[PDB]
Design a protein around this motif. Sequence first.
Motif, PDB file in Angstrom:
ATOM      1  N   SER A  21       5.836  14.386   6.642  1.00  0.00           N
ATOM      2  CA  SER A  21       4.597  14.817   6.020  1.00  0.00           C
ATOM      3  C   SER A  21       4.631  16.313   5.769  1.00  0.00           C
ATOM      4  CB  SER A  21       3.394  14.475   6.885  1.00  0.00           C
ATOM      5  OG  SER A  21       2.200  14.924   6.285  1.00  0.00           O
ATOM      6  N   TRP A  22       3.905  16.737   4.750  1.00  0.00           N
ATOM      7  CA  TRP A  22       4.054  18.096   4.283  1.00  0.00           C
ATOM      8  C   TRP A  22       2.701  18.756   4.060  1.00  0.00           C
ATOM      9  CZ3 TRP A  22       8.088  21.199   4.159  1.00  0.00           C
ATOM     10  CH2 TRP A  22       8.096  22.305   3.302  1.00  0.00           C
ATOM     11  N   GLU A  23       1.609  18.052   4.353  1.00  0.00           N
ATOM     12  CA  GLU A  23       0.278  18.630   4.395  1.00  0.00           C
ATOM     13  C   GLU A  23      -0.524  17.931   5.485  1.00  0.00           C
ATOM     14  OE1 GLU A  23      -2.091  16.219   0.900  1.00  0.00           O
ATOM     15  OE2 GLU A  23      -0.611  17.735   0.339  1.00  0.00           O
ATOM     16  N   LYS A  24      -1.435  18.674   6.104  1.00  0.00           N
ATOM     17  CA  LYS A  24      -2.259  18.121   7.172  1.00  0.00           C
ATOM     18  C   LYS A  24      -3.270  17.146   6.592  1.00  0.00           C
ATOM     19  CE  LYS A  24      -5.262  20.723   9.257  1.00  0.00           C
ATOM     20  NZ  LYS A  24      -5.812  21.788  10.120  1.00  0.00           N
ATOM     21  N   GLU A  25      -3.292  15.912   7.092  1.00  0.00           N
ATOM     22  CA  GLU A  25      -4.265  14.937   6.611  1.00  0.00           C
ATOM     23  C   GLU A  25      -4.270  13.717   7.519  1.00  0.00           C
ATOM     24  OE1 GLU A  25      -1.347  12.622   3.466  1.00  0.00           O
ATOM     25  OE2 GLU A  25      -2.884  14.019   2.758  1.00  0.00           O
ATOM     26  N   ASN A  26      -5.251  12.851   7.285  1.00  0.00           N
ATOM     27  CA  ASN A  26      -5.299  11.530   7.887  1.00  0.00           C
ATOM     28  C   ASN A  26      -4.467  10.540   7.088  1.00  0.00           C
ATOM     29  OD1 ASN A  26      -7.108  11.767  10.173  1.00  0.00           O
ATOM     30  ND2 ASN A  26      -8.720  12.153   8.676  1.00  0.00           N
ATOM     31  N   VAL A  27      -3.911   9.559   7.790  1.00  0.00           N
ATOM     32  CA  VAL A  27      -3.232   8.428   7.172  1.00  0.00           C
ATOM     33  C   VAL A  27      -3.829   7.166   7.766  1.00  0.00           C
ATOM     34  CG1 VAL A  27      -1.065   7.287   6.729  1.00  0.00           C
ATOM     35  CG2 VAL A  27      -1.137   9.746   6.882  1.00  0.00           C
ATOM     36  N   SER A  28      -4.402   6.319   6.923  1.00  0.00           N
ATOM     37  CA  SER A  28      -5.104   5.154   7.432  1.00  0.00           C
ATOM     38  C   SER A  28      -4.121   4.157   8.017  1.00  0.00           C
ATOM     39  CB  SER A  28      -5.925   4.490   6.333  1.00  0.00           C
ATOM     40  OG  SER A  28      -5.097   3.829   5.400  1.00  0.00           O
ATOM     41  N   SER A  29      -4.631   3.291   8.888  1.00  0.00           N
ATOM     42  CA  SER A  29      -3.782   2.266   9.475  1.00  0.00           C
ATOM     43  C   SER A  29      -3.267   1.305   8.411  1.00  0.00           C
ATOM     44  CB  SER A  29      -4.545   1.518  10.562  1.00  0.00           C
ATOM     45  OG  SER A  29      -5.401   0.551   9.997  1.00  0.00           O
ATOM     46  N   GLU A  30      -4.109   0.981   7.423  1.00  0.00           N
ATOM     47  CA  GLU A  30      -3.697   0.105   6.331  1.00  0.00           C
ATOM     48  C   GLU A  30      -2.583   0.726   5.509  1.00  0.00           C
ATOM     49  OE1 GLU A  30      -6.575   0.969   7.143  1.00  0.00           O
ATOM     50  OE2 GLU A  30      -7.810  -0.805   7.525  1.00  0.00           O
ATOM     51  N   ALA A  31      -2.706   2.009   5.188  1.00  0.00           N
ATOM     52  CA  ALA A  31      -1.671   2.674   4.410  1.00  0.00           C
ATOM     53  C   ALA A  31      -0.357   2.676   5.164  1.00  0.00           C
ATOM     54  CB  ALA A  31      -2.097   4.103   4.084  1.00  0.00           C
ATOM     55  N   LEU A  32      -0.433   2.785   6.480  1.00  0.00           N
ATOM     56  CA  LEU A  32       0.765   2.894   7.295  1.00  0.00           C
ATOM     57  C   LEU A  32       1.431   1.532   7.461  1.00  0.00           C
ATOM     58  CD1 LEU A  32       2.306   4.889   9.116  1.00  0.00           C
ATOM     59  CD2 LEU A  32       0.613   4.444  10.869  1.00  0.00           C
ATOM     60  N   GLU A  33       0.631   0.465   7.509  1.00  0.00           N
ATOM     61  CA  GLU A  33       1.155  -0.894   7.420  1.00  0.00           C
ATOM     62  C   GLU A  33       1.801  -1.160   6.071  1.00  0.00           C
ATOM     63  OE1 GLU A  33       1.372  -3.111   9.787  1.00  0.00           O
ATOM     64  OE2 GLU A  33       2.055  -4.787   8.564  1.00  0.00           O
ATOM     65  N   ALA A  34       1.153  -0.733   4.989  1.00  0.00           N
ATOM     66  CA  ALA A  34       1.700  -0.974   3.659  1.00  0.00           C
ATOM     67  C   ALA A  34       3.035  -0.273   3.482  1.00  0.00           C
ATOM     68  CB  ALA A  34       0.709  -0.517   2.593  1.00  0.00           C
ATOM     69  N   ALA A  35       3.160   0.944   4.004  1.00  0.00           N
ATOM     70  CA  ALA A  35       4.419   1.671   3.906  1.00  0.00           C
ATOM     71  C   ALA A  35       5.526   0.978   4.684  1.00  0.00           C
ATOM     72  CB  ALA A  35       4.233   3.096   4.406  1.00  0.00           C
ATOM     73  N   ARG A  36       5.206   0.455   5.867  1.00  0.00           N
ATOM     74  CA  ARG A  36       6.199  -0.250   6.669  1.00  0.00           C
ATOM     75  C   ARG A  36       6.797  -1.412   5.893  1.00  0.00           C
ATOM     76  NH1 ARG A  36       6.969  -4.591   9.562  1.00  0.00           N
ATOM     77  NH2 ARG A  36       4.965  -5.549   9.032  1.00  0.00           N
ATOM     78  N   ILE A  37       5.943  -2.226   5.277  1.00  0.00           N
ATOM     79  CA  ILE A  37       6.416  -3.407   4.568  1.00  0.00           C
ATOM     80  C   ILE A  37       7.214  -3.016   3.337  1.00  0.00           C
ATOM     81  CG2 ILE A  37       5.679  -5.372   3.222  1.00  0.00           C
ATOM     82  CD1 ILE A  37       3.384  -5.659   5.253  1.00  0.00           C
ATOM     83  N   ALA A  38       6.742  -2.020   2.591  1.00  0.00           N
ATOM     84  CA  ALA A  38       7.468  -1.589   1.403  1.00  0.00           C
ATOM     85  C   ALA A  38       8.871  -1.132   1.765  1.00  0.00           C
ATOM     86  CB  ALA A  38       6.702  -0.476   0.691  1.00  0.00           C
ATOM     87  N   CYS A  39       8.997  -0.350   2.835  1.00  0.00           N
ATOM     88  CA  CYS A  39      10.317   0.081   3.282  1.00  0.00           C
ATOM     89  C   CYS A  39      11.131  -1.088   3.817  1.00  0.00           C
ATOM     90  CB  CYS A  39      10.180   1.170   4.343  1.00  0.00           C
ATOM     91  SG  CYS A  39      11.730   1.968   4.778  1.00  0.00           S
ATOM     92  N   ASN A  40      10.493  -2.004   4.541  1.00  0.00           N
ATOM     93  CA  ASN A  40      11.229  -3.111   5.140  1.00  0.00           C
ATOM     94  C   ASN A  40      11.795  -4.043   4.075  1.00  0.00           C
ATOM     95  OD1 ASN A  40      11.961  -4.944   7.451  1.00  0.00           O
ATOM     96  ND2 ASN A  40      10.549  -6.266   6.331  1.00  0.00           N
ATOM     97  N   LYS A  41      10.954  -4.476   3.134  1.00  0.00           N
ATOM     98  CA  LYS A  41      11.391  -5.455   2.144  1.00  0.00           C
ATOM     99  C   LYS A  41      12.531  -4.915   1.294  1.00  0.00           C
ATOM    100  CE  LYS A  41       7.887  -8.884   1.094  1.00  0.00           C
ATOM    101  NZ  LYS A  41       7.481  -9.230   2.480  1.00  0.00           N
ATOM    102  N   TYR A  42      12.439  -3.658   0.875  1.00  0.00           N
ATOM    103  CA  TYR A  42      13.521  -3.058   0.105  1.00  0.00           C
ATOM    104  C   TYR A  42      14.809  -2.994   0.902  1.00  0.00           C
ATOM    105  CZ  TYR A  42      15.692   0.047  -3.260  1.00  0.00           C
ATOM    106  OH  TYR A  42      16.533   0.610  -4.180  1.00  0.00           O
ATOM    107  N   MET A  43      14.752  -2.408   2.094  1.00  0.00           N
ATOM    108  CA  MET A  43      15.983  -2.137   2.819  1.00  0.00           C
ATOM    109  C   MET A  43      16.666  -3.440   3.216  1.00  0.00           C
ATOM    110  SD  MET A  43      17.917   0.336   3.793  1.00  0.00           S
ATOM    111  CE  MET A  43      19.500   0.110   4.594  1.00  0.00           C
ATOM    112  N   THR A  44      15.880  -4.500   3.409  1.00  0.00           N
ATOM    113  CA  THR A  44      16.453  -5.817   3.650  1.00  0.00           C
ATOM    114  C   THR A  44      17.274  -6.302   2.466  1.00  0.00           C
ATOM    115  OG1 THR A  44      14.564  -6.379   5.055  1.00  0.00           O
ATOM    116  CG2 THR A  44      15.954  -8.180   4.243  1.00  0.00           C
TER     117      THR A  44
END
Lengths: 164, 50, 156, 273, 205
Positions: free
Chosen positions: E53-76
């Motif tokens: 991260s490169w700026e101070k901010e909140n990251v929602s739990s939903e956004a963080l779940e969505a990022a996990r899946i996007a990274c997981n499905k691709y790398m698989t």
Amino acid sequence: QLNPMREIKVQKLVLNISVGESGDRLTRAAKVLEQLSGQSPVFSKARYTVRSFGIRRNEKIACYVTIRGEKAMQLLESGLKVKEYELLRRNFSDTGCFGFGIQEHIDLGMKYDPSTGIYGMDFFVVLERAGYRVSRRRRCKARVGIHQRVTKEDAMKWFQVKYE
Amino acid sequence: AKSKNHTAHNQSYKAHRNGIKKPKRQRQASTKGMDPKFLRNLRYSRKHNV
Amino acid sequence: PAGHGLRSRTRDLFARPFRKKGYIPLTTYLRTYKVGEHVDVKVNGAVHKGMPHKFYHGRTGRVWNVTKRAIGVEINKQVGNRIIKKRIHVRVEHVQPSRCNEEFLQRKLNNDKLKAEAKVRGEVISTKRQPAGPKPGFMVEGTTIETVTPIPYDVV
Amino acid sequence: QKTRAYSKRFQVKFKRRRQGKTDYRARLRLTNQDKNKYNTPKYRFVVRFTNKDVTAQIVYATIAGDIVMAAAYSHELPRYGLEVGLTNYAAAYCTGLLLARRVLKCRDLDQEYEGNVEATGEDFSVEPADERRPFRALLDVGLIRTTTGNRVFGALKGALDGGLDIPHSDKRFAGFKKDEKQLDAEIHRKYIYGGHVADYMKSLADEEPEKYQSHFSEYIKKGIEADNMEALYKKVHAAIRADPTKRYNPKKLTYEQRKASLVERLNALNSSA
Amino acid sequence: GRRPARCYRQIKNKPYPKSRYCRGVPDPKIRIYDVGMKKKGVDEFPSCVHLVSWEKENVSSEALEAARIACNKYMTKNAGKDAFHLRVRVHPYHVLRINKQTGMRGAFGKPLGTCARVDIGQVLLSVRCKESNAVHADEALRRAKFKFPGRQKIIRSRKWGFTKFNRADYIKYKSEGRIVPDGVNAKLLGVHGPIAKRAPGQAIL
RNA sequence: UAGCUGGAGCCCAUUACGAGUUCUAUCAGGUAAAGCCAAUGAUUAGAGGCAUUGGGGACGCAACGUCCUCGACCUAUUCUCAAACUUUAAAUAGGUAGGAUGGCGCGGCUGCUUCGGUGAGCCGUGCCAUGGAAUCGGGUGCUCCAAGUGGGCCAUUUUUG
RNA sequence: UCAACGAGAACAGAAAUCUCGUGUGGAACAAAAGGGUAAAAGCUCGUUUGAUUCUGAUUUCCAGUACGAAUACGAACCGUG
RNA sequence: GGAUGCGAUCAUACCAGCACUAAGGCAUCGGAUCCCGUCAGAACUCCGAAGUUAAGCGUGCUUGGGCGAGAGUAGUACAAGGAUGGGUGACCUCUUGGGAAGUCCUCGUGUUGCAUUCCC
RNA sequence: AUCAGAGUGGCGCAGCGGAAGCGUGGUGGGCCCAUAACCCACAGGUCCCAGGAUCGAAACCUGGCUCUGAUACCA
Ligand SMILES: [Mg+2]
Ligand SMILES: [Mg+2]
Ligand SMILES: [Mg+2]
Ligand SMILES: [Mg+2]
Ligand SMILES: [Mg+2]
Ligand SMILES: [Mg+2]
Ligand SMILES: [Mg+2]
Ligand SMILES: [Mg+2]
Ligand SMILES: [Mg+2]
Ligand SMILES: [Mg+2]
Ligand SMILES: [Mg+2]
Ligand SMILES: [Mg+2]
Ligand SMILES: [Mg+2]
Ligand SMILES: [Mg+2]
Ligand SMILES: [Mg+2]
Ligand SMILES: [Mg+2]
Ligand SMILES: [Mg+2]
Ligand SMILES: [Mg+2]
């Protein structure tokens, strides 16, 4: 090392009888324990009120006595004759001491002097060496050094090598 | 209509207009409130001075 | 009262320090106080009698009275545009002797000695401290000189 | 066997508490002077018993540590005549009486406050003579249980009859009747002169030819019969009143020898298979 | 459903965790943080890539779940499900509130959702893999970048695996036998302890 | 009602007495940061061990035996955290002191204190005390009488919904 | 000396009673929370009524008013030891 | 070089495991008439010297835990003041000043007062 | 939307900490040619769920879940 201060000796023999009542059942358990000991017993009031055993809080349910001296040795070996002078070898505490149980009348002393039933009882005996005072005196209490302690192995040998 | 208001705004300014006064330092400070036993004796010692 | 109690907001102020609870050392009871000394007030959590109110903690006053088990301390308190000299009694456990004038007495007796001493000689000197001023000139021996330069930026 | 967090959060007690020799609740309350007396020390009349000796001391409190005004022991009674029974009730009276007389001579008032010369079983308090009140001390009993007949109260009577003022009440003297709330001076006097030992000397030598031998061997060794208590103690009392007055441990290893041995243990273990 | 995330982007309140005071919180969207293979050892996957991260901010739990899946499905899909280890480095410990005639009377909000407080230079996702599969590492995180609100960078770790040793230092200490493996972590050996606890090839000075 | 203000003065005054300020010395703090590989609490994952039987399958012709299985539990680690958590711990701000209202000798008082001239204090006398950091400067210093005001608002910073 | 834990004893087991070891408080202290306390401030036992009398002072509140509450002496009478 | 009584500081003094000690002292230790005390002479109390340094004690050892200190962390985090400073903003920078904390590393493990006493 | 109420045997209901029942229904005998009705017995309960205090809880406070009544006006 075989220093003479290290001779193992019984400090006390404790006899426990738990009943779970009051009134006359526990009172007569007191008399058998008194007449076995030679000294006025003490009652043990309950705790936690476990209704499955039907005991309330602060109501006396047991009776025990702590004998030492020559009465202890005389009384101990009579208990061990009943057990035929052997034990389960799991009977020995990790620290220093052991216990067993019987069914009363097989000792010496008539049955129905008061017409009192067969109360089984808990013989628990604790060994020591000389100098255990240093953990029981009021001024300058301290741990008894490891070499002056009695281990389960020393109690095992004390039982078998002598005393019988 | 919101009738409760509190602030310490302007109060240090008002305090320092006529200074934060300190009381005048006095020779022979006051003994009121000291130990009465000590004070009776001090009075008696002074009564019998020569 | 009026919204806050006596020991309000004293969760951290009145607590004992870490691993320094339990027994009170005998040095606190052996120190003797005289009317006119300086004393620093710091409350002890254990002693619930003679306690000063939390404003007097961390403040230095003069002794003005001495009874058994207690000292009368003398703290100035600013109230509005004035200074009220509050007079309180605190038990001995809550005060310690101050060193706010430790230096003054050692310097005072030092001053008197030199003042009389130089009077045995020609009798004019000045026993005044002086703030640190500017350093005189001096020559530095030519030795190893290490150059330093700005460092290129490392991305990690 | 104890966890790392256990030691990190642990607080040690005052050293004399870990070693188990001082009661600090009593110590504070004994030493703590009122602040409006400013240096008037509170003198403690310390009385201690070992298994084999009797220690007595007049001490007062200082920031550096206590300071002895006068000390006495029962092992120095053989100077005055008593050879055996140096830890019993009668000896405590002698040791207490000795301490009183030394300090009163050491503070230059033993002439004014003689105490009383013939030891009496009565509870005694010395009168406030004139212009110089008697020396005052506090009995500091330590950790022992304060029981009726305790020897520390034998020592207390000696100091009182030596001429010291000690705050006291008579309920713990030997002979006191817990059910009658009165002092028995006769039983107290017998204990003062060791007569309670004498009765047990008679009781053994009659019905116990051998218990009397072993149990009182040093008495027998020195020719002190049970009918020679009152006579023998009185002389020790009057005598006291009339004249009160290399390497074996290993050294710590230096830095080099620890690092020397540690290199060996390292080389030994690494080379061990 | 949820408000637009812009209501809760900026870090504006002191941390408000669930506690004996904050209760009746919902459950966070993300509930799994290490996906892929978390059984491989230290020496296997040495190359590591981070999304920072490169700026101070909140990251929602939903956004963080969505990022996990996007990274997981691709790398698989590209390198196989056993070629990577994805670890989420931020946990949603902060609660958000919502204030739902009635106006600003008694306006303290009831809990809404959960979010993570992130700061500049803070790692959001980390991936360790073989050097060969680093490309699917680079793109998987970049494809995950578009699930996050702020500014993020993709910085390749100077360290080994998910361990605190430089690749230079880990190899030196490995060949010298001074590092004992643990699993995902490595444990360098020192000059302390009781001598007997060491195996005879592992005692050092 | 107190504060802020005016008017009336009066009392001293460059001796000193101070000060919205520094320097010297000395007290006090638990916020920012940090920590969790320190207590309390939250929380991710493995690794190694292991039971006095949390459970079973298989071998138990037996047991004071085990291989697995979810796993407790134990040890060394690991990610991430805390207004109502914390060992540690700032910057700024807070308190006290920097002599003439100091010190000493002598001889007196006490009904207080002491085992006691022992102290605590005070009284009288007699001596000393180069003015005891920088800077600046007459004072609400003292007292009286009284007006208006008691809707505020704005900006940078800290900060609650 | 507590909470709790370990090891033991007929019926007796997860849990009745007894015994030894470890035990910085992880218990308890009428009640919320915070602080405080280990030869205690907790537990058990003894003896008790200072939960007494007189009027002043101070602290918190604060206008430096009152009340409430608290603190330190003075003058008494007692408890305990 | 030791010890006891009373202590000061209150872990460099604690904790865990070990090893050893001349003298004297402590202690362990023997007993239960007496005072006292308990279910229990275990404790406590009292009287005692037949034995034992086995324990307590003391001193030393450990690539021990802790604790204490140092260097580092790091001029980093943060923070007082100023800017018609940069940037859309979040934030950051420069100028005039102050400046921490864990991991990690090195070292250390008490000092001592009064009184009486033992060495050899 | 908030707030009051109420969750107990198959069903409708009582239950004031020592602590579980009323009606009806179930099960097995009897009476009858045989069913009911009648007679004799027998068995029933995650006391809504998770806590917490309590000599000691289905009852007492706290949180979670489901059914019911309510008050929501001047514009
Ligand atoms: Mg207003
Ligand atoms: Mg207020
Ligand atoms: Mg009011
Ligand atoms: Mg009001
Ligand atoms: Mg504090
Ligand atoms: Mg009180
Ligand atoms: Mg006592
Ligand atoms: Mg006005
Ligand atoms: Mg605070
Ligand atoms: Mg913070
Ligand atoms: Mg920290
Ligand atoms: Mg933690
Ligand atoms: Mg300052
Ligand atoms: Mg007005
Ligand atoms: Mg007590
Ligand atoms: Mg008031
Ligand atoms: Mg039918
Ligand atoms: Mg029919």
